[PDB]
């Protein structure tokens, strides 16, 4: 009653604040097995000393007290072992979050002409978490500077871009960065900005400063496009595709300088054109979008069990834009690096197999237990039913399905006869036994023998034959009008030992007689030694059709049909 | 901020709420205020508002409140740094019947929320800015009015802040010392809280020594 | 034995034999897991040799033994008529060493009741012992001319109790 | 009430000493510290004025 290690929870790539309250950091590895899983961890593809006061362990989860940049940063992986083999967790990279504040420098006061925009550097300091959200503020913190076609805030550089300057744009301006990962928000020194007023403001052409470059990104991702230009007349920005239609999943937004793509598909690949215009002139930028895809499963493997010596093929299939490479780890180490077609299974092969699909980009795991069988046959679980019934002139079939390992050979024995493939008698390979057109001499004592390389098993069967249940009087066809009372005739002959029933069917659908609706028009009155007729009251158009009487017992069943026509 | 696991708090339509910040130790006391994670400044009015202590107070929760999350934020003057507490969320419950042929809820008395009990004592130093707060809870948005024991409020120096829930004075002398109280007037009921304002004075120059030339 | 539907295990009198490492399995159809417990069999002090009363003739040598076994080892504390040994009336015959007290050439002097408190973190044990000096001839403590009956191949006993100032 | 209610309590149809260290009051609710069989047992009633 064995069972291999199976994972529930696996570790994730993780990040710890340098200046944290928490002095403890933790990684999860959770699994289940019949012999409890035993856990090992490795650091940078190298062993870790288990008890160091600093380091400690709890139920597969690893703990470090007072972790240090200098020491603990690296890639950790978790090995769940038992008696049946080893299984590697997903690679988990551990880093220390870094977010120093800005350079303390004074930022010079800024003077500009009305009608000419300008741009200010955030000066982003060192950061280990890269999920940076940028905005800009005025005088005091809570004030916020909003997106128009005039003003914009880059989400990559972190700077602020203005096309057209007005008297309202004067005052203090400060950068603002938030890291949601570590929940930290910091802001740069304020910069004074003054626009000198100018009447009959000097017009300037469209001038592209913010591009969106050739990018390789994965299937199904969120993707966002920045495109911005400058000039005295508020520049108008327009998006299109070169030589294809825009993807359905496109949203333009109010600003008209930012473009959303939900669920990038195969077809979106190619060039995208951004046209920045104004009253005076124009400019264009063309960008390359390359679609990729992480490896994603199609027929991931599952827990399989087979016999020894059987020729095996493991179907493992994933799909990626970069064609996936397949690796086969046996108990936490690579065993095969190609089509896992195996011949001549053995003792030692059995256990834990890991199918990994990695490309140039990403990797995905699939774990499976391959179990091996070599049991002697027993009838403990699926024994033979001792007693079986038969009628003359009818095909009859007997199950001999026990539980053996190497798919052994079969035999049947009638006391003083060995029975084999014949004209009317066949033993199909699954182990069951067929007989056609039975006779009185067939009834008797049969034994099923299951003959295995390693041991055999024998079960006993007793087979009795009875006088067949047949129909003496068949139903006769009838024609009537609407509202008539009709009768269908049926008589059968049978053996006293047997338990017999009568079943009436309409148009090859059995009347159940179990619900009150049917009894409205239909009635049954079985009597005598043979008599089993049916009555119909208040005939309708729908009632006309085929009526079949079936005399059914546990040995065989005999059927006979007739027709009913309705007029009016 | 200490990384804490936060289940969102729940409420039936129109019950009172006290949303607690409790920052990690702060010298000086940081600038406290409430933000959405969407980075929008959060709805503040007579009905619902933030305390000087930093916690947020809902006299009565409404339907709309479910729209967005509420996150506490604290600025430290010197390092120019802001700390963001893990954001909260709320859920509302409606028992209003579906009136046939086309506020369907119960109205309720006021109650005191921040200054529990009738009485409290505060100490402010001479010349300092004096600041008092009173927090109520009634289904019809209560109105806070501030008054003083057997004496008129100096209108030149005092003013209402934070939608009538805060009173602020200028330099405080022994004149201003005494007993101040606050009314949470509401359509259904009304209640007073008293505060003992003892003004104790920091040393100040009567005759400052000047240089002697002889 | 099993108690509480196999979720509790109980043992009788415990010794250092039973000390060690015990664990428990939560076998189940889906998974199974072990918990380990370090069973350190420590002990409140218990008497190995309890000091029994010393009867001596003038000039005979006696020693008091206070040996209690405990884990951790129990600390021995010596008092004289409930007075600290430090400030007790000085005696030349008396010699204290480790856990043992020695009187060589004992005399009428220093006749008192000595107390031993062997204690550790967990518990303590207290023992008293006194010395009595008398000068009496041997005495008979049972009935005269006893009649005792017994069968052939069975164990038997004759009780002839006695006592004397020097061990007769 | 519009002018906030003021509370009085009476013990055995008799007035009660308000601050006795023992006795104390909060928003119309009455409190006794270390109550005694000998002393406090009785019928109390509350007057909102
Ligand atoms: C990157 O891209 C991913 C998308 O791949 C973004 O993922 C987003 O995640 C959130 C969180 O799961 C999704 O939010 C959901 O929000 C709905 C709230 O809306 C419901 O109520 C609205 C008001 O009545 C109503 O307008 C909604 O219907 C609109 O929106 C849906 C999409 O939600 C849209 O398909 C419709 O056409 C409408 O326009 C909707 O009725 C909330 O109900 C969801 O919770 C349900 O499902 C969760 C399980 O997911 C379940 O646990 C709950 O009990 C409940 O049943 C869910 O929170 C959001 O939709 C995703 N964005 C999408 C799909 O575009 C991710 O945000 C992007 N990155 C960044 C950084 O933003
Ligand atoms: C004594 O007599 C018995 C009975 O006649 C003999 O047993 C017969 O042996 C033959 C030959 O080996 C078997 O035919 C094989 O069938 C295989 C397919 O088996 C599956 O399907 C069978 C039928 O199922 C039908 O319906 C399903 C569901 O709709 C369909 O999917 C299916 O296609 C059929 O239409 C099932 O009965 C069976 O359990 C399986 O599920 C074939 O794959 C097989 O061909 C292979 O092997 C050949 C050599 O054997 C080889 O030439 C081929 O290239 C290929 O490799 C073969 O055709 C019968 O199944 C089996 N039982 C019968 C007929 O009842 C027995 O051998 C004989 N003893 C002797 C001669 O010593
Ligand atoms: C005087 O003292 C002697 C010796 O001490 C006593 O003899 C004992 O008598 C008892 C019976 O009262 C004996 O118990 C016997 O046990 C036998 C089995 O002994 C073996 O297994 C036991 C454990 O079950 C071991 O402890 C032991 O070592 C042996 O290995 C039974 O077979 C006996 O029953 C049969 O024989 C007796 C004989 O007297 C018959 O009367 C019974 O009807 C029966 O047929 C018996 O039960 C015990 O073994 C003896 N020895 C000891 C050392 O105790 C006398 O009892 C005592 N009084 C007299 C002699 O009057
Ligand atoms: C904190 O508050 C306390 C309490 O109010 C202040 O302390 C004392 O307050 C009393 C008022 O209760 C003052 O008494 C006043 O004294 C005035 C003296 O006149 C001079 O000072 C006036 C301002 O106090 C000033 O306006 C005046 O000039 C005016 O008239 C001129 C023409 O004549 C004109 O040109 C000027 O521009 C101006 O309009 C004189 O300079 C008197 O005038 C008042 O009527 C009143 O009697 C005390 O003086 C206050 N104590 C002191 C030491 O001055 C305390 O000052 C407050 N502290 C702060 C920092 O505000
Ligand atoms: C827990 O408490 C018990 C009870 O007090 C302690 O048992 C004492 O153990 C000591 C040390 O072994 C014994 O001294 C021995 O005595 C032997 C004689 O034992 C025979 O007679 C017993 C009745 O008096 C009888 O129970 C015993 O049979 C049992 O033990 C046999 C051991 O061989 C076993 O074969 C039998 O099947 C049965 O289980 C004997 O017939 C003697 O042979 C030894 O040489 C030695 O002198 C004490 O006698 C025991 N106590 C009693 C009352 O007999 C035990 O040590 C305690 N354990 C802890 C950890 O504290
Ligand atoms: C399949 O075919 C094999 C080989 O013929 C059968 O093996 C023996 O079959 C006979 C049939 O009569 C069995 O006798 C039966 O015993 C039943 C109860 O079993 C009792 O004996 C068993 C062992 O006996 C064997 O070993 C002794 C050793 O001294 C030999 O002397 C015997 O000859 C036997 O070989 C015990 O294990 C069991 O606990 C019982 O005490 C009884 O109910 C039946 O009425 C009948 O008398 C014989 O037991 C079989 N022996 C073995 C080893 O299998 C086999 O039974 C057949 N199986 C079936 C299902 O038919
Ligand atoms: C944007 O950044 C700018 C960068 O400096 C900043 O100037 C601007 O606002 C603040 O503006 C105030 C005044 O409005 C400045 O305060 C002044 O400081 C002077 C010395 O540096 C001082 O002499 C002056 O004094 C005035 O008042 C006294 C009476 O009290 C009178 O006697 C004098 O004659 C003067 O009239 C005044 O106090 C700040 O220095 C300045 N910078 C800050 C606060 O950082 C920023 N805000 C906006 C909206 O543009
Ligand atoms: C393995 O899983 C696939 C996908 O669910 C399923 O089609 C297949 O039949 C499974 N095979 C086994 C042996 O469970």
Numbering used by the authors:
A (entry chain B): 37 to 604
B (entry chain D): 136 to 237, 248 to 359
C (entry chain C): 304 to 471
D (entry chain A): 69 to 117
Passage from the reporting paper:
Cell-surface expressed contactin 1 and neurofascin 155 control wiring of the nervous system and interact across cells to form and maintain paranodal myelin-axon junctions. Defining subfamily features are extracellular six N-terminal immunoglobulin-like domains (Ig), four fibronectin type III domains (FnIII) and posttranslational modifications, i.e., N-glycosylation at multiple sites and a C-terminal glycophosphatidylinositol (GPI)-membrane anchor. To address these questions, we structurally characterized the contactin 1 and neurofascin 155 interacting regions, i.e., Ig1–Ig6, individually and in complex.
At the center of the heteromeric complex an intermolecular “super” β-sheet is formed by antiparallel hydrogen bonding of the outer G β-strands located in the Ig2 GFC β-sheet of both molecules. Here Ig1 AB loops of both molecules contact edges of the opposing Ig2 domains formed by the Ig2 N-terminus and G β-strand. The contactin 1–neurofascin 155 interaction interface is conserved among vertebrate orthologues indicating that the interface features we identify in the complex structure are likely to be crucial to contactin 1–neurofascin 155 mediated interactions. The glycan at contactin 1 Asn208 is in near vicinity to Ig2 of neurofascin 155, while the glycan on contactin Asn258 extends into proximity of glycans attached to Asn457 and Asn494 on Ig5 of neurofascin 155. Based on the contactin 1–neurofascin 155 structure we designed two interface mutant versions in which hydrophobic residues at the “bottom side” of the Ig2 GFC super β-sheet are changed to charged residues that we predict would prevent contactin 1–neurofascin 155 heterophilic and neurofascin 155 homophilic trans interaction.
